[model samples]
Every structure is written in structure tokens, then in C-alpha cells.
Target: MEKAMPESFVVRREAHLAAPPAAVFALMTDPEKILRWMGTEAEVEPEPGGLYLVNVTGARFARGSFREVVPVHRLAYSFGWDGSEVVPPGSSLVEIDLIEQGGGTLLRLTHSGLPSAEQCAGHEEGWAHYLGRLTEVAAGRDPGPDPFYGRRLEHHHHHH
Candidate 1:
């Protein structure tokens, strides 16, 4: 008998913001403003041991604590959904790194430690959607209505 291989599972997203690093970092560190671009509701404390929560309506959500935070450069945290009921604790980890590129900011995000392909796919789409929103917001523009609201629209396009 052959041993079974684990399912493919990983979500990585990167976006370039045409804004200064300080401005982009400001948005990431601000819990109030972060909700506008990332999740419906959030509570973020941008420091080590700070707790962060991202509520996606009534379906699924993630809550975790910051493991590391470096001013305007990097942030790392442990992330997991309502594990006791839906997922499992120690489900995932998220890291956000920001680099100053000329007059813009480059954001590299990785969400790892997923246990299933379905979870990875969902997170891939979710991060892609939010990154676009983050770019718009960082550039001082309103991202308008979120197309990913309620339903997932595969045809929506985001131009940098």
C-alpha cells in the first residue's frame, strides 16, 4: 500500500502600492481603517502579543495574536478561524512584509500552514481581493463597493 500525500495547501499574495511606505504602513497599523479594506470587522493591536480579529460576516472568521511587528517594515502573526467548532487551532500563519520601492511600497503577504486545498483556495482569493483594495486605499482612492461581497465574482478585474 502507498502512503497518501497531503493535499496542496498554501496561499501567497503580493501587491505593489503606488504610495509611500509610511502611508501604507499607517493603514495596516490602524484597526479602524483596516476594516475598510480588509474585513467587515477587525480589532488589531499592532504590537507583539497584540490580538487581531477578522470577521467575515457570520460564515467564517479568524483571530490571532501578533508574533512580531517592526514599525513600517514587517508583521507576523498566528491566524486561525473559529477552530474549536469549524477549523483547528494552529491552523495558519500570516506574514506581511513591506518594502519601500522608489516612491511606492511593495507588500508581500504569505498565509501558510493551511491543512486543506479548499482552505488555501479560499484564502488565495480573499487575499487577492483585499490586496487590490489596499492598493486603492493606499493611493488615496476609494475602492468603491467590494465586488467580492456576498458572492465571488471571478470576472472582476483590478488594474494597477
Candidate 2:
């Protein structure tokens, strides 16, 4: 009999957008375009070993580094929070694939290596929120404002 492995959590998200793969890829990598949908500030370098930092909500930052970068098709990055101990920078992996469909794109994302099921659920909510914004922007429409803008973590000062 084989040994059982410990539980590992992952979050998956998918979206259909009214933009081409190249347009979707540009929206993800280009900082200015990113702010059109998500993030208050973004500094993404879409090359291998490049930085992937974003002040996502104007209060929290997501920090990571690129592991793979295939233009208009795929991206793989190491992702985590900047000041979090449980999910520190580069602690997890995020993979995305853009498949060209009809005249638009099929975006599929997988986030893995989370420490617990709680983290998985949290990230699932976050991905769904952001991907929804991305979808709106990709459709050449404005998503107005982000309701979660400037929202801070509950335990911002509780470090032991």
C-alpha cells in the first residue's frame, strides 16, 4: 500500500472574456492596463525571474515573482502577501492559461500550495472578485469602482 500524502489546498478560477488573448495578456502584465480593472498600483514584470507586485486594494499588497512567461498564452508565478507570515512572498504558485475561443478568450487560473483550506477559500473569493473585474474591462466596459478599495486586513497590527 502507498503512503497517504498530507492535504494541500488549491483555488481554481475560470472566465470568459470578450477580448483577444493578446489583449487579455496585456491587461495582466501592463501596470496601467491592470489598474483599469484591478489594483490601485501594479508593478508586474512579465519575464522569468521578474517582479510581480501589486497594491491590490490600496491597503494590501500581493508580492510575487514570475517563474514562467509565455506571451499571449500562459503564465506561472510564485505568489503571496508582502507582510504576511502565513503566506509570505513566493510561498505559493499561480498558473494561468489563456485559450483563444471564437473571437475572445477563455481564461483559466489555478492557485496552489496554500497552507490551509481557509487560505484556499480566501484566495478563491479574491480571484473571483478580480477576475470579474478583468472580465468587465476586457469587454470594453468600465467596472466603475472597486467596493473593496482601501480595505485593510483585520489583524494589521497583531504580530507576535
Candidate 3:
């Protein structure tokens, strides 16, 4: 049987933050600040060839190296699973763009190169959730707390 796939999975999410581009960019690049919204733990070195890891606590996770970085404008990185024996590395890519809009920042995120429709949908929800948190944090509000820290979702079960 052939595997079903999405025509072309391109999950995009955007948020308008009240912070300046530099402040939002700083939060995006700072590992400590990133954990407040995106992951359990994150390590990103904002340069070409630098690596990034997004720990989803107990779900589908990705760890990859940076492919490109353009300060407050763009960031591109490779993505793959850390505990997958079936899926090979270099399976996906995530690109983030920050645009200055008036007195605030516009965050545009894209996670592409997923192999299947299921993967695309899962990541679509994941990015949407985190991007909402990012918007909250960038607006100088706390995200309350991590909800996925020890809880596993029904559809996915691979943590980083």
C-alpha cells in the first residue's frame, strides 16, 4: 500500500506583537526566553551552521542545524527527529521571518518539508500553539505555565 501524503505541506502562522523587532528578535534568539513559549528547552546559535534543538517535552521533536540567519529578518534551519529509528535525518526545515510593522513586530513562521499529511497537521497545531505563546510573551505577558511538560498527547509520542 502506498502512503498518503499532503499535496504540499506548508504550515504558516503569524502574530502581531507589541514589542519592537529587536526585542522580539532577541526573545526568538534567546534560549532562556524561547523556552517561555516555544519549547521545554532550546539551544540556538544564531549563525549559519549553528545547531538548534526544540524539546517538546513528550512529543514529536526536532533537532537540527541552522542553514541561514539574517538578524531580525529571517532564519532557516534543518529539522529531524532525535529518537526516530525509522525516519532519517534532514527531513524538514523551518523558516522564521520577522517584519517590522509600525510600532510592533510581525512574526511569520513556516515549517515545511514534512513527509506526510499527519506530520504536517501535527506541526501545524504545534506551531500555532507556540506562536500564540510567543505573542503573549513578546507583549510582556507571562504564558502562565507549560501545559505539555509531562503530559503526552494522544496522536504523538516522541519527546526531545
Could you give the C-alpha RMSD of every candidate to the true structure, in order shown? 9.3, 8.7, 8.8
- Judging by lDDT against the true structure, name the best candidate: 2
**Model 1: residues >4 Å from true position, as ranges?**
1-8, 45-63, 81-89, 146-160
Per-prediction TM-score, please? 0.68, 0.71, 0.67
How well does candidate 1 score on lDDT at residue 21?
76
Clash total of candidate 1? 0
lDDT of 2 by residue, 4-93 (tens): 323556677788887899988777768987665656667766578766556654343244455777988898775463223445444566
Query: Which pairs of residues clash in candidate 3, taking residues 3 or more apart in a chain or in different chains?
Result: 59-158
Candidates 2 and 3 compared: the better one by TM-score is 2
Over the stretch 102-160, how does candidate 1's per-residue lDDT look in tens digits?
85778888876667666666667767766777777887755676654433456767897
Q: What's model 3's lDDT at 109?
A: 79
Error of 2 at 123 (Å): 0.9
For residue 84, model 1's alpha carbon misses the true position, in angstroms, by 11
Distance from true location, Cα of 95 in model 1, Å: 0.4
User: 69, model 2: CA deviation in Å?
Assistant: 1.0
